[PDB]
Amino acid sequence: IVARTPKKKPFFWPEQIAGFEHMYDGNDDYPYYLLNRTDENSGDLPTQPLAYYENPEVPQANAYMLEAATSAVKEVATLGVDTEAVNGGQVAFDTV
CB of 15 to its own copies, least distance (A): 6
Closest CA to 37 of 68, 53, 13, 58: 13
- Write each residue from 17 to 56 as x if it is in contact with its own copies (CB under 8 A), else as -, in one continuous string: x---x--xxxxx--xxxxxxxx---xx-xx-x-xxxxxxx
Mapped onto helix, strand or coil, the DSSP state of residue 95 is helix
Q: Compute the least distance from the CB of residue 56 to its own copies, in Å.
A: 4
Question: Distance between CA atoms of 61 and 17, rounded to whole angstroms?
Answer: 40
Rounded to a whole number of angstroms, the minimum distance from the CB of residue 80 to its own copies is 10
Helix (H, G, I), strand (E, B) or coil at 11: strand
Q: Which of 7, 32, 3 is nearest to 19 (CA)?
A: 32
- Residues in contact with its own copies, total (CB under 8 A)? 74
Is there binding between residue 57 and its own copies (CB under 8 A)? Answer: yes
